[PDB]
Amino acid sequence: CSLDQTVAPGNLTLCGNATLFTTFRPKARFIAPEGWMNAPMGLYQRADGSIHAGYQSHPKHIQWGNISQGAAYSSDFTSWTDFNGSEGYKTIWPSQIYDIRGVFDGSIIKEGIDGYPTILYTSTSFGPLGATLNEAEGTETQSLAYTTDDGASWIKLGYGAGQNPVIYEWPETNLTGFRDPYVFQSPRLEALLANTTSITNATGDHFATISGGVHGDGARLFLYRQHTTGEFIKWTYLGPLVTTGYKESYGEWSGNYGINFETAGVTRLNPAGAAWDNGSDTTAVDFVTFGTEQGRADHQNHWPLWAAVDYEVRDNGSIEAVIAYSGVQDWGRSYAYASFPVEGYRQVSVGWIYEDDDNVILAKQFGYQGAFTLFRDLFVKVVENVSPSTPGLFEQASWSTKNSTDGMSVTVTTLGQRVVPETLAAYKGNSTVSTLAPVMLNESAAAYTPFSSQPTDRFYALTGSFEFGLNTTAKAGFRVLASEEEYTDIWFDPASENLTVVRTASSLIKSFGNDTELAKVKLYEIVGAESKTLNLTVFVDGSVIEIYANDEVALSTRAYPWLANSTGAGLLADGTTAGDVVGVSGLELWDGLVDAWPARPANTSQGLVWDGPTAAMYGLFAGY
Amino acid sequence: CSLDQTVAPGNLTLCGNATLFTTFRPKARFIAPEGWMNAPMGLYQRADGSIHAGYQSHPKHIQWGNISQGAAYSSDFTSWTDFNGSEGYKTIWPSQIYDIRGVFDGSIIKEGIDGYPTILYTSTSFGPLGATLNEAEGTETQSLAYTTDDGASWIKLGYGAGQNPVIYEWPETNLTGFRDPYVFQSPRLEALLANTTSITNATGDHFATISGGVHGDGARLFLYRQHTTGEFIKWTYLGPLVTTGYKESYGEWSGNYGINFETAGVTRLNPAGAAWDNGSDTTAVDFVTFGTEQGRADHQNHWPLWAAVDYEVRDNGSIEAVIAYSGVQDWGRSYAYASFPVEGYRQVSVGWIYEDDDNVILAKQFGYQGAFTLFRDLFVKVVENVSPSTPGLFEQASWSTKNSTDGMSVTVTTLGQRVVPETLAAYKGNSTVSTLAPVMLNESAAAYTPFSSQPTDRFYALTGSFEFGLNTTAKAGFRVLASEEEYTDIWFDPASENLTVVRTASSLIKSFGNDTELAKVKLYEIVGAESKTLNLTVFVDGSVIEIYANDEVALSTRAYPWLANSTGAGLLADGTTAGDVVGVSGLELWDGLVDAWPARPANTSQGLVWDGPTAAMYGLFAGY
Ligand SMILES: *[C@@H]1O[C@H](CO)[C@@H](O[C@@H]2O[C@H](CO)[C@@H](O[C@@H]3O[C@H](CO[C@H]4O[C@H](CO[C@H]5O[C@H](CO)[C@@H](O)[C@H](O)[C@@H]5O[C@H]5O[C@H](CO)[C@@H](O)[C@H](O)[C@@H]5O)[C@@H](O)[C@H](O[C@H]5O[C@H](CO)[C@@H](O)[C@H](O)[C@@H]5O)[C@@H]4O)[C@@H](O)[C@H](O[C@H]4O[C@H](CO)[C@@H](O)[C@H](O)[C@@H]4O[C@H]4O[C@H](CO)[C@@H](O)[C@H](O)[C@@H]4O[C@H]4O[C@H](CO)[C@@H](O)[C@H](O)[C@@H]4O)[C@@H]3O)[C@H](O)[C@H]2NC(C)=O)[C@H](O)[C@H]1NC(C)=O
Ligand SMILES: *[C@@H]1O[C@H](CO)[C@@H](O[C@@H]2O[C@H](CO)[C@@H](O[C@@H]3O[C@H](CO[C@H]4O[C@H](CO[C@H]5O[C@H](CO)[C@@H](O)[C@H](O)[C@@H]5O[C@H]5O[C@H](CO)[C@@H](O)[C@H](O)[C@@H]5O)[C@@H](O)[C@H](O[C@H]5O[C@H](CO)[C@@H](O)[C@H](O)[C@@H]5O)[C@@H]4O)[C@@H](O)[C@H](O[C@H]4O[C@H](CO)[C@@H](O)[C@H](O)[C@@H]4O[C@H]4O[C@H](CO)[C@@H](O)[C@H](O)[C@@H]4O[C@H]4O[C@H](CO)[C@@H](O)[C@H](O)[C@@H]4O)[C@@H]3O)[C@H](O)[C@H]2NC(C)=O)[C@H](O)[C@H]1NC(C)=O
Ligand SMILES: *[C@@H]1O[C@H](CO)[C@@H](O[C@@H]2O[C@H](CO)[C@@H](O[C@@H]3O[C@H](CO[C@H]4O[C@H](CO)[C@@H](O)[C@H](O[C@H]5O[C@H](CO)[C@@H](O)[C@H](O)[C@@H]5O)[C@@H]4O)[C@@H](O)[C@H](O[C@H]4O[C@H](CO)[C@@H](O)[C@H](O)[C@@H]4O[C@H]4O[C@H](CO)[C@@H](O)[C@H](O)[C@@H]4O)[C@@H]3O)[C@H](O)[C@H]2NC(C)=O)[C@H](O)[C@H]1NC(C)=O
Ligand SMILES: *[C@@H]1O[C@H](CO)[C@@H](O[C@@H]2O[C@H](CO)[C@@H](O[C@@H]3O[C@H](CO[C@H]4O[C@H](CO)[C@@H](O)[C@H](O[C@H]5O[C@H](CO)[C@@H](O)[C@H](O)[C@@H]5O)[C@@H]4O)[C@@H](O)[C@H](O[C@H]4O[C@H](CO)[C@@H](O)[C@H](O)[C@@H]4O[C@H]4O[C@H](CO)[C@@H](O)[C@H](O)[C@@H]4O)[C@@H]3O)[C@H](O)[C@H]2NC(C)=O)[C@H](O)[C@H]1NC(C)=O
Ligand SMILES: OC[C@H]1O[C@@](CO)(O[C@H]2O[C@H](CO)[C@@H](O)[C@H](O)[C@H]2O)[C@@H](O)[C@@H]1O
Ligand SMILES: OC[C@H]1O[C@@](CO)(O[C@H]2O[C@H](CO)[C@@H](O)[C@H](O)[C@H]2O)[C@@H](O)[C@@H]1O
Ligand SMILES: OC[C@H]1O[C@@](CO)(O[C@H]2O[C@H](CO)[C@@H](O)[C@H](O)[C@H]2O)[C@@H](O)[C@@H]1O
Ligand SMILES: OC[C@H]1O[C@@](CO)(O[C@H]2O[C@H](CO)[C@@H](O)[C@H](O)[C@H]2O)[C@@H](O)[C@@H]1O
Ligand SMILES: *[C@@H]1O[C@H](CO)[C@@H](O)[C@H](O)[C@H]1NC(C)=O
Ligand SMILES: *[C@@H]1O[C@H](CO)[C@@H](O)[C@H](O)[C@H]1NC(C)=O
Ligand SMILES: *[C@@H]1O[C@H](CO)[C@@H](O)[C@H](O)[C@H]1NC(C)=O
Ligand SMILES: *[C@@H]1O[C@H](CO)[C@@H](O)[C@H](O)[C@H]1NC(C)=O
Numbered sequence A, B: 001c002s003l004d005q006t007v008a009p010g011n012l013t014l015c016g017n018a019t020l021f022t023t024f025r026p027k028a029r030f031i032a033p034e035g036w037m038n039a040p041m042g043l044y045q046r047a048d049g050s051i052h053a054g055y056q057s058h059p060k061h062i063q064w065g066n067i068s069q070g071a072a073y074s075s076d077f078t079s080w081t082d083f084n085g086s087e088g089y090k091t092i093w094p095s096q097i098y099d100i101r102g103v104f105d106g107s108i109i110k111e112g113i114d115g116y117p118t119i120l121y122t123s124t125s126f127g128p129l130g131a132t133l134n135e136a137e138g139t140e141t142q143s144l145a146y147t148t149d150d151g152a153s154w155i156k157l158g159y160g161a162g163q164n165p166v167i168y169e170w171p172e173t174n175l176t177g178f179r180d181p182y183v184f185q186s187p188r189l190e191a192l193l194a195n196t197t198s199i200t201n202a203t204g205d206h207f208a209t210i211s212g213g214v215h216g217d218g219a220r221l222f223l224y225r226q227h228t229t230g231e232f233i234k235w236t237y238l239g240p241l242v243t244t245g246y247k248e249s250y251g252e253w254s255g256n257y258g259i260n261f262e263t264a265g266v267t268r269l270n271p272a273g274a275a276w277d278n279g280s281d282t283t284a285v286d287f288v289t290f291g292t293e294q295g296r297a298d299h300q301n302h303w304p305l306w307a308a309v310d311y312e313v314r315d316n317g318s319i320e321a322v323i324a325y326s327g328v329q330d331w332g333r334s335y336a337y338a339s340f341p342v343e344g345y346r347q348v349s350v351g352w353i354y355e356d357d358d359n360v361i362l363a364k365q366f367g368y369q370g371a372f373t374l375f376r377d378l379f380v381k382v383v384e385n386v387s388p389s390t391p392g393l394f395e396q397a398s399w400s401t402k403n404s405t406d407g408m409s410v411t412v413t414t415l416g417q418r419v420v421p422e423t424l425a426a427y428k429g430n431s432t433v434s435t436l437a438p439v440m441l442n443e444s445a446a447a448y449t450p451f452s453s454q455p456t457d458r459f460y461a462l463t464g465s466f467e468f469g470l471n472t473t474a475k476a477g478f479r480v481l482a483s484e485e486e487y488t489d490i491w492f493d494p495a496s497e498n499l500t501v502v503r504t505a506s507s508l509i510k511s512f513g514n515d516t517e518l519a520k521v522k523l524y525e526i527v528g529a530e531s532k533t534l535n536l537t538v539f540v541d542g543s544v545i546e547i548y549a550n551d552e553v554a555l556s557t558r559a560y561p562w563l564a565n566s567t568g569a570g571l572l573a574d575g576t577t578a579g580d581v582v583g584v585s586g587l588e589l590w591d592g593l594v595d596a597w598p599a600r601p602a603n604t605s606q607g608l609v610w611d612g613p614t615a616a617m618y619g620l621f622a623g624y
């Protein structure tokens, strides 16, 4: 095993465990110290204003298993510190018959048991578990734990009658899944159900959804309500909140609803951020965010989706969330988005970016798998004065339209997503910032034009506004992680409405994924404008490439170039002519970003271990 | 629920939990503070000379489940003190994927991990488990833990490759069971295998048996040897030590070998006690003690047996233990005998006495189930100058015979068992002792003759020597726990060689067992004697009746008389005439015995709990 990054890569499968630990590793984002991570969990803003973030964790392994909560905290979403206790950076782990198979995703009741922050989580035990298997009741249940030390440790309720697990009965038969409880307060839902509480007797101020589905008959999000305020054992099943069909799709802008939901959450937003009104704010919109399984040919069969919903009250004192329009939260290699409230009327969302090594060829050599996305403020994106001649506008696919009285303009409403400003400020302020001169891309434009300033490593951000003619057939974007032999091309093609990431040349290492990523982006044309604009922000962080368009569209992906000098960046142009011109302005390079884990040394590997021959006997975890 | 013990019992199933806690409860023996117990485990003499005793335990329940090690200690086998830690009187409990289904029986390596006492125990996980079920590999494995604080707590080795569990591969396919590791040193076995260690490479100073069997083909005791002295991870399978047939029986004196072994141990004894020679002591005998399953119509399908064995060395460097003769360790409601070495060349054995409430009618009202037997010294019983005309003598069923050179007398050899002298001394010294005048039972004898002194409660011992004519047809023995309406009759009938406990009148409460207990007792007739003698010792301790004959035969059983005055005792006589006389001498009553748990209050119940609806979902434990 040679680690010479000035020559072509050898056979890297001969390299030892964690020998490639720093080679492709993100530095500017949330990631475990080592080993396996997946879904964010247990997210809450603590009493001191800091953010507690948990995550599904399997230390000293590079596949999933013994799944536990790892945790850390931050005062600004950006610079983090690990918890360190008797189990290292873990704070909840399998320990009881009811959760021994894994401590799955959970969410926080901020004033819970004895007034302490309390997690409701999926506690798993033995038996077939999965949407394509024949799971039985009891394999997935829901349990409580609380913390008296602000998340350094958690105390589980005892096992037994009237204690853990607190939710165990399946609400319908033949579930595909029964997990990922999302606890939330909702003046909106309380107002809607206030006339029906005699029917159900459930009058608590907390609701909880549980994600799943029914075999052969599509996904389900099940709604529960806390039975009595200030009491946390009894949760009353109201009914299905969201019901979708077996592999139903709302269309090209909306992914596919698959067979089973995961990590679903419920929020209410307005143009400024989170909305906590009872229905009285006419600018507020109810949203559900959710993952779907088995409705996708690639990306681990996983779509992270969202839908705007209109709530209807059923006669049995339950709620139907009728989907009004439906979109995609991220179009790339990310999943398991969790959202949580943050003071100042914010709802903040973060997901998990998996690697692109699905055959597990270099995972041991990495010594880790996975990272988070950046933390994102959610809000209602409102575009005013939209031209009715915007192509495809009245499809109303992942947005809504409201005509002006005179019919000459439209107001467009959709889900907005933008990187939390704390992170943008810290990134910019800690970087070497190069403000770049505008560039007109015309007949003289090369295919690739390097920026006048270049990055110095694999940790940078780019911003640009691309102004296109209304009938352009030109393409433009950014090339990143670029040398002559390796590069990753981010293209937007207004004629097809497709944002793509072409990765055929991303790396000389052939075992990594190289498929083309794709997102749909609607450029809403403004009344009286003779052009249309794409605002693109791109973060390059080790192997992560995370793309944001117009505070709306997100696409996370991976690139693993071998060569030390595959760090360059610049502009891409295709079909730009004297007459079909692309004006690029607002160009900025931020070189360096932030060291997100200042207390950690560069190499936080502790080695990898094998569970031994019993792993195959038990059949629950891969074992490595 | 009335607790009036001066009138007939009402419907006691209406009584609350633990309302009958003290009513039938032993006071003078090892018993858990409350709840469920079964097999002794983890027995060893500590560095300070005290005895550590563990037991299979399920606190606050009255059926088996979450099976854990409860523990206590004693300096004299007799007066005990509970450990008290973070889990009360438990010291090992289910906590890892490999043992979450139960911490089953285990035994002690005295100088183990880092020089500390170390337990090798059966760690159980999910799946069908049982001799009549289709168990698979991995469900039962063997794991290590060690103590740095003399048994107050135990630290398990980590889960994984080269750590726990340390034995997981089945030595043959289709096992009926794979548990109860018994670790022991043996100069005998080391000497026998010394010429074969090249074949196996196993040269350690510890051996371990694991108890089981093969479906359809009888029980098996599997022998392992520690691979290297001072190292405790690697244990090498040598071969089957004991192989018996599917429900094979050696005869009327030997129970039945069933389909599966449990709690098996290996020892070597001589007339004085434990023998630690390499084979050079010609008075020493190799013994195996073991439980069998599914070879008995009653007594929970369980026989606690023993066999004298002759070891043969196989060509593959393993040992066959050929059964020379075979007996019964206890003929009544006891099982799961464990033996352990004690300083002064002793081997001490103790078992578990279950209740006689197999339909679980009053278990909740008790608030506990189970106790230990008394602790017993094992030795080789040798009877010299035995008459060749002793009936059935050359059957050599559970004994061996050696003729004198002239053929006029025989030396008989069998397993001896006697209550440890520490307990006999303490019992006698703390009791009110009444030495009773001898009684000739003849034509004038009533059926029942009360002793001249009577017990004052349900805690007493009786001794007597019954001298019978060589051709008697008379019966005699002891009645205990006796009033006019309730009593338990212990009879010996020399003509049939049967010791019986008749329990048709033991209690007015009809839900308890009332079947007749039976043991075979061989009165070895001495050359020149014109009579034959039965030395009977009986312990009455709450509901326990524990009978010892001639330091050889043991029979433990249960009686639950309701009436407060059903405490009396005396002599039984049947068919005694002027010519067929039974001379009773050495009669002594010890009233009171010892308070075995002086620190415990009378009622150590902490209530009972239910595991809730998930107990049936998981399907592992009853839940109560
Ligand atoms: C199979 O058997 C298993 C083993 O038995 C069993 O698991 C065990 O289950 C039991 C019962 O559910 C659990 O017991 C609970 O423990 C909770 C605390 O748990 C935390 O702390 C313990 C112990 O703490 C110490 O010991 C460890 C180990 O040495 C040290 O690390 C610590 O530093 C600490 O040491 C100090 O204290 C020691 C003595 O205790 C000293 O020796 C020492 O010197 C130190 O000073 C830990 O062991 C726990 O760790 C385990 O669990 C965590 C997850 O929780 C894991 O991460 C970890 O790996 C371990 O597995 C843990 O950290 C108790 O809170 C709980 O007590 C209450 O509940 C019951 C009711 O259910 C009540 O009886 C009792 O009164 C308590 O409730 C009161 O208090 C709470 C708030 O504090 C109130 O909400 C409640 O209403 C009530 O209030 C009362 O008082 C008020 C007045 O103040 C009054 O106003 C109220 O009205 C009311 O009266 C309970 O004891 C036990 O932890 C499990 N153990 C393990 C190892 O798993 C398993 O379930 C079984 N399985 C099956 C299938 O049956
Ligand atoms: C799923 O995830 C699960 C959770 O991660 C996982 O279970 C965990 O597995 C790990 C790894 O196997 C276990 O870690 C081991 O822990 C052993 C000690 O265990 C005992 O102590 C711990 C911790 O102790 C404290 O914390 C608790 C909780 O707060 C307190 O109650 C205590 O008071 C104590 O607190 C003090 O210390 C704290 C910090 O640690 C402070 O915060 C605090 O202020 C106090 O000061 C307990 O948690 C354990 O309890 C659990 O387990 C018991 C059974 O064991 C249960 O009954 C109980 O309910 C709990 O479940 C327990 O009591 C360590 O000994 C062990 O460390 C060694 O082994 C590894 C190799 O495997 C080495 O890396 C390491 O060096 C250690 O080995 C050295 O030491 C030993 C002798 O001491 C030598 O034999 C050895 O050779 C070596 O010697 C070295 O040093 C020598 C020089 O001195 C040198 O000469 C030698 O050459 C050599 O270098 C390991 O850390 C962990 O306990 C599990 N946790 C739980 C909760 O289960 C599970 O397996 C996962 N499942 C799957 C399927 O993957
Ligand atoms: C005295 O000790 C006991 C512990 O032994 C304490 O706890 C009680 O324990 C018993 C079991 O011994 C439990 O009985 C079982 O109850 C099941 C239904 O329970 C529900 O209804 C009752 C009645 O109002 C409620 O009290 C329960 O509420 C509690 O539990 C829920 C969780 O479900 C919590 O949310 C609450 O907060 C409470 O904690 C329940 O809502 C019942 O199904 C079960 O069924 C069988 O057993 C009986 C008797 O043998 C049969 O008649 C019946 O046919 C069922 O038999 C089964 O038997 C075999 C083998 O098991 C199976 O193969 C069959 O298919 C069949 O299913 C049983 O009756 C009791 O619920 C529980 N009480 C609790 C926790 O409060 C007592 O509390 C304690 N008392 C005191 C004063 O301390
Ligand atoms: C680097 O990290 C790893 C952790 O990832 C550390 O531990 C090693 O981990 C790997 C797995 O990543 C283990 O590989 C597996 O080994 C199995 C056979 O092992 C035995 O032989 C080896 C070789 O001499 C010994 O080292 C082992 O000894 C250790 O374990 C025993 C317990 O058994 C202990 O007693 C010892 O003390 C040691 O701790 C063993 O004796 C092997 O069966 C297993 O098989 C598959 O995997 C490969 C690769 O994918 C395939 O070629 C093969 O076909 C098998 O594939 C399976 O794949 C699928 C899915 O799993 C199944 O469906 C198939 O049916 C099929 O079974 C694998 O190769 C390795 O043993 C282990 N080493 C240890 C513990 O020492 C490294 O130590 C660490 N390195 C350093 C320097 O720190
Ligand atoms: O770590 C479990 C956690 O991850 C999610 C989201 O991806 O589920 C994954 O893990 C399950 C258990 O292996 C799989 O069945 C599932 O297909 C997979 O997506 C959460 O739903 C869960 O809490
Ligand atoms: O934030 C104002 C308002 O919202 C409520 C809704 O019941 O609480 C939400 O907002 C808090 C601040 O972000 C969160 O801590 C809380 O978890 C969330 O439910 C009100 O309590 C509050 O007055
Ligand atoms: O507590 C388990 C312990 O008891 C024994 C001896 O009786 O086994 C009993 O428990 C097993 C598990 O429920 C049963 O399969 C078995 O039939 C029963 O005798 C020990 O062998 C075991 O270690
Ligand atoms: O007891 C004398 C002699 O026996 C050995 C056998 O190797 O140890 C046994 O006896 C000890 C005392 O009862 C026990 O502690 C020990 O566990 C048992 O193997 C010798 O070590 C000792 O010299
Ligand atoms: C980058 O490195 C490779 C190999 O060292 C080299 O061929 C190339 O010229 C270098 N510089 C570039 C592409 O600017
Ligand atoms: C309420 O009605 C809906 C629609 O019929 C149904 O799915 C749900 O199960 C009902 N709730 C109950 C039975 O609690
Ligand atoms: C919205 O405006 C477009 C263009 O003016 C028109 O085609 C459509 O009918 C209008 N819809 C409504 C509801 O008025
Ligand atoms: C650098 O980053 C840190 C950590 O997020 C942040 O607190 C600090 O303000 C940043 N420095 C700037 C903006 O100059």
Ligand SMILES: *[C@@H]1O[C@H](CO)[C@@H](O)[C@H](O)[C@H]1NC(C)=O
Residues within 6 Å of the ligand: A252, A493, A496, A497, A498, A518, A520
């Ligand atoms: C653009 O995207 C869609 C997928 O939504 C695809 O079917 C179409 O072929 C793409 N067109 C071009 C020109 O890339």
Ligand SMILES: *[C@@H]1O[C@H](CO)[C@@H](O)[C@H](O)[C@H]1NC(C)=O
Residues within 6 Å of the ligand: B005, B006, B007, B483, B484, B485, B563, B565
């Ligand atoms: C024992 O008690 C019962 C009921 O109180 C009574 O009938 C009997 O006479 C008492 N005394 C005896 C049997 O000596």
Ligand SMILES: *[C@@H]1O[C@H](CO)[C@@H](O)[C@H](O)[C@H]1NC(C)=O
Residues within 6 Å of the ligand: B237, B238, B239, B240, B314, B316, B318
């Ligand atoms: C040794 O021989 C015996 C008798 O053939 C056999 O049962 C045992 O399995 C053998 N040991 C091995 C293969 O280790």
Ligand SMILES: *[C@@H]1O[C@H](CO)[C@@H](O)[C@H](O)[C@H]1NC(C)=O
Residues within 6 Å of the ligand: B388, B403, B407, B408
């Ligand atoms: C043992 O003694 C009896 C009676 O003297 C006799 O029947 C038998 O043959 C003797 N056995 C041997 C081996 O001498």
Ligand SMILES: *[C@@H]1O[C@H](CO)[C@@H](O)[C@H](O)[C@H]1NC(C)=O
Residues within 6 Å of the ligand: B076, B078, B079, B425, B426, B427, B428, B429, B430, B594
């Ligand atoms: C009473 O019993 C205790 C506890 O076993 C014992 O130590 C003491 O010697 C006994 N008293 C006597 C024999 O007088």
Ligand SMILES: *[C@@H]1O[C@H](CO)[C@@H](O)[C@H](O)[C@H]1NC(C)=O
Residues within 6 Å of the ligand: B252, B493, B496, B497, B498, B518, B520
């Ligand atoms: C004595 O015991 C045996 C069982 O070993 C039995 O078959 C026989 O009938 C009994 N005989 C008498 C008279 O009790």
